[PDB]
Design a protein around this ligand. Structure first.
Ligand SMILES: O=c1ccn([C@@H]2O[C@H](COP(=O)(O)OP(=O)(O)O)[C@@H](O)[C@H]2O)c(=O)[nH]1
Length: 370
């Protein structure tokens, strides 16, 4: 019996999609998968034993504490062979690091008033419980930067870390698309031949720099701008970003969608992925774009940004972030067809020659070992 803990399941988040693939791989190996969550949105595999954990606190952190306590009591009466968490909390045998190091985020970005809060104390305590010395929890990591951050703040025993390769779903790959996918999916989405389709995918618009993408779109010269659309796709509220697009005179250029299950089709249709995130532990969409043959504009703060430079299929904007640099990079990318075509070919080559896929199998090996 392998118990999986994540606070919330929904289909449009990276943590959630990594969990789904890892848990499915574990179940397919013949183990019984139990899932504890506060809420589950979308389809659930029939094989999984899904337990909805009741909570009543009015804060996220209060609910998370309630969840931890409830699951401990349930495990007491209904023991599991291994406990795997996708969120930081006490009691885990294995943790999957979908998130950034909180202690480092706070140290770099927050001040005294932020550290006064019960919320800060909770998230710090639950991260500490997972990473501190003396714990047995195995720590499945996505980047070297994560490891460096956790070592800085917790001095975690190095042997407990294991970096995993990416786990991009093969359905995004250019070679897994129907013939004429670019034409068919552009037509399906109302995209004309002469139009430049910019695509931004992710369920946290603020964190992922949707504002920076809209600013970049608005900065384009008039004729080019008239021919350029931005699709913003994710389970988040568009309001603030609609207001910004209106301010900048590009509301009609920007199309907002809730969570979509056809991202593979949008990537086949698109001309560039824009992902100028403020914060991103890894960024699955960056590598999905690589596999789709879709060139990428992103920011150096993203854990997976280096892959864009490695694949030579776009531009990574350096810190400190310069909007003017993003603006010019966008203008160049849209005006220089040979550059964009070379990037696209480079992406396809990298997707065909690199391991961007084995995460679920390697994670399942760690989880089921012994
Ligand atoms: O509307 C959406 C939004 C996101 N995703 C998928 O959700 C994952 C997002 O992971 P990422 O690491 O990019 O961002 P996170 O959600 O973890 O911040 C990727 O597989 C996306 O393709 C999706 O299918 N539809």
């Amino acid at each position: 019996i392998v118990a999986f803990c994540l606070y919330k399941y929904f289909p449009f988040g990276g943590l959630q999609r990594d969990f789904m693939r890892i848990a499915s791989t574990v179940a397919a190996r013949g183990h019984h998968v139990r899932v504890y969550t506060q809420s589950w949105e979308g389809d659930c595999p029939k094989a999984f034993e899904l337990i909805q954990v009741p909570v009543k606190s009015h804060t996220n952190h209060g609910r998370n504490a309630e969840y931890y306590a409830w699951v401990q009591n349930h495990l007491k009466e209904h023991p599991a062979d291994r406990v795997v968490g996708f969120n930081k909390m006490p009691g885990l045998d294995v943790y999957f690091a979908a998130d950034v190091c909180y202690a480092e985020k706070v140290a770099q970005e927050k001040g005294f008033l932020y550290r006064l809060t019960s919320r800060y104390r909770h998230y710090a305590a639950f991260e500490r419980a997972t990473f501190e010395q003396g714990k047995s929890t195995k720590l499945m990591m996505l980047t070297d930067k994560q490891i460096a951050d956790f070592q800085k703040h917790y001095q975690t025993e190095p042997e407990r870390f294991q970096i995993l390769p990416p786990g991009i779903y093969p359905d995004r790959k250019y070679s897994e698309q129907i013939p004429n996918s670019r034409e068919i999916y552009r037509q399906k989405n109302g995209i004309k031949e002469q139009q430049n389709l910019l695509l931004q995918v992710g369920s946290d618009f603020g964190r992922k720099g949707v504002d920076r993408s809209i600013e970049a779109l608005a900065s384009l010269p008039e004729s080019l701008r008239h021919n350029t659309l931005l699709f913003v796709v994710g389970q988040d509220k568009p309001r603030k970003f609609e207001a910004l697009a209106e301010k900048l005179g590009v509301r009609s250029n920007v199309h907002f969608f809730s969570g979509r299950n056809d991202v593979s089709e949008l990537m086949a249709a698109a001309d560039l992925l824009l992902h100028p995130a403020y914060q991103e532990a890894a960024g699955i969409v960056l590598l999905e774009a690589i596999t789709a043959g879709l060139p990428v504009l992103t920011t150096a703060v993203c854990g997976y940004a280096h892959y864009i430079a490695d694949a030579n299929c776009g531009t990574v904007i350096a810190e400190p972030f310069s909007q003017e640099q993003l603006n010019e990079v966008l203008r160049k990318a849209l005006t220089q067809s040979p550059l964009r075509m070379a990037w696209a070919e480079n992406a396809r080559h990298y997707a065909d020659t690199q391991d961007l896929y084995s995460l679920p199998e390697k994670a399942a090996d760690i989880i089921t070992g012994g």
